Nucleic acid binder design. Structure first.
Length: 493
DNA sequence: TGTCCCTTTATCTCTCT
DNA sequence: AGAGAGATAAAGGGACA
């Protein structure tokens, strides 16, 4: 008999128990833990179900699943119940910060290293606790924290980096590797190739940073003489996760895409210059003639879809869904292109296929409004949030559907909608803002933090902003969101 | 196997003007 | 509004005890 059977049966038995109180986990949550944390993590959750949920830690089940669902999940669960009170009371961290550090492979190691190194990194190295938390909150967080402790001085003194830069480099998975590589390669890339430290940090500050830097050192000469790429173009391609893969693929496919399809080098660089750039390039090479065939999509439009993170997914999804979206739901191909041309274009396309009939018939939106909401990053999330919150926002809060659509139709739309639903009553009732003013603040990228900043200034007034009326604060918040409010505080004092 | 660390890709949100 | 950046997450491989 297959050996995994006994372990599988154990998994399934324990999993069934966890559907009961006090966690009541669903099928998804259960598979998620089993998939990454394994059967030991599933058993640890059950074993420590009571100690985690209520007094003293009071963790949500979502927080328990998030800690459990990684390699060493069992170890992280034990460690959190032990160290969460310590880190909150002895270092002044929030439970949310402790859970964030815990929620990665080897979270035990990160937690214990934070407990050990936070004081010396803050006192002897000048870091804030937030920076230590951010360094800790990735796979290998322990290695990154120890490497920041060791290398912060030589990186700032011998190599000219700021602590912000070092923290930025450290704050990715593999952070130790990127730090050690930047130490070695910063003089090489700057002096031999005329890169600024700022360009080097940008290349370093992603997962696999070590790989991208070494690949830039290796390929920059070939790319910038043979192919005729500029150093700036190479830096842009390198400055994303999978940067090594994107750079090697540009070397491969730049002449192929230009000659076989008449794409420009600038168009190829743009496609390469996203997360998954390698996948996007290879997919364009395969699919462009399939998409463009017989006055179909233009190359221009194919390039546009491809020129976002996960562009491969958007391209394949357009190939799948262009006909049904146009036949059944009556969209123009220009509209499908618009929806596809953002990060997560695949998710947005599939969500439009799924929710266009419902938002139209059940909620009285136009296809144009559904398209407008879908046509931003996180379009799927905004569409699902509009479906969920249109009734309470309209019926209980007095907003028109037009206003809801406007709030929804920006990056972060979901966050803006949920924040309006939350804070509209206190902003209007308690502080006298009009609904239209609240809608205006929320109808921008960064809607959520702009609303939260306003709420904070109205609830716990900072004298630095006191000279501004509510109307002036609204104007500032619409103009530049949270950053503008913060920028204004700094100007005052 | 269980755990830790590293890399790549995809998705979501916010900033910067 | 459209170009950068972090943020979060899934998932695979190397390593080793």
């Amino acid at each position: 008999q297959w050996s995994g059977a006994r372990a599988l049966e154990a998994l399934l038995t324990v999993a069934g128990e966890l559907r009961g109180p006090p966690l009541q986990l669903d099928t998804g949550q259960l598979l998620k833990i089993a998939k990454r944390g394994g059967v030991t993590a599933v058993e640890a959750v059950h074993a420590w179900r009571n100690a985690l949920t209520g007094a003293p830690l009071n963790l949500t089940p979502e927080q328990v699943v998030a800690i459990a669902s990684h390699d060493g999940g069992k170890q992280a669960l034990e460690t959190v119940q032990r160290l969460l009170p310590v880190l909150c009371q002895a270092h002044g961290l929030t439970p949310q910060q402790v859970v964030a550090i815990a929620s990665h492979d080897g979270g035990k190691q990160a937690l214990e290293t934070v407990q050990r190194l936070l004081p010396v990194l803050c006192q002897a190295h000048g870091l804030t606790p937030e920076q230590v938390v951010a360094i800790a909150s990735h796979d290998g967080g322990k290695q990154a924290l120890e490497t920041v402790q060791a290398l912060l001085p030589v990186l700032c003194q011998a190599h000219g980096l700021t602590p912000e830069q070092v923290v930025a480099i450290a704050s990715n998975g593999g952070g130790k590797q990127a730090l050690e590589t930047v130490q070695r390669l910063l003089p090489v890339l700057c002096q031999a190739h005329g890169l600024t430290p700022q360009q080097v940090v940008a290349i370093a500050s992603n997962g696999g940073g070590k790989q991208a830097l070494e690949t830039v050192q290796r390929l920059l000469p070939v790319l910038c003489q043979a192919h005729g790429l500029t150093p700036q173009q190479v830096v842009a391609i390198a400055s994303n996760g999978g940067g090594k893969q994107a750079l090697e693929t540009v070397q491969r496919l730049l002449p192929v895409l230009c000659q076989a399809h008449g794409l420009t080098p600038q168009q190829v660089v743009a496609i390469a210059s996203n997360l998954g750039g390698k996948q996007a390039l290879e997919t364009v090479q395969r699919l462009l003639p399939v998409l463009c065939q017989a006055h179909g999509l233009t190359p221009q439009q194919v390039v546009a879809i491809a020129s976002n993170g996960g562009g491969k997914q958007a391209l394949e999804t357009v190939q799948r869904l262009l006909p049904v979206l146009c036949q059944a739901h009556g969209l123009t191909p220009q509209q499908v292109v618009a929806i596809a041309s953002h990060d997560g274009g695949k998710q947005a396309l599939e969500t439009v296929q799924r929710l266009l009939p419902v938002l139209c018939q059940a909620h009285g939106l136009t296809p144009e409004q559904v398209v407008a909401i879908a046509s931003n990053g996180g379009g799927k999330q905004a569409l699902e949030t509009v479906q969920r919150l249109l009734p309470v926002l309209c019926q209980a809060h007095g907003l028109t559907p037009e206003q809801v659509v406007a709030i929804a139709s920006h990056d972060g739309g979901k966050q803006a909608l949920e924040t309006v639903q939350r804070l509209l009553p206190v902003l209007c009732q308690a502080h006298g803002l009009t609904p239209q003013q609240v809608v205006a603040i929320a109808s921008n990228g960064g809607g959520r933090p702009a609303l939260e900043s306003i709420v904070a200034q109205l609830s716990r007034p900072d004298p630095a902003l006191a000279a501004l009326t509510n109307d002036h604060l609204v104007a500032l918040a619409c103009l530049g969101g949270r950053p503008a409010l913060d920028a204004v505080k700094k100007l005052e004092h």
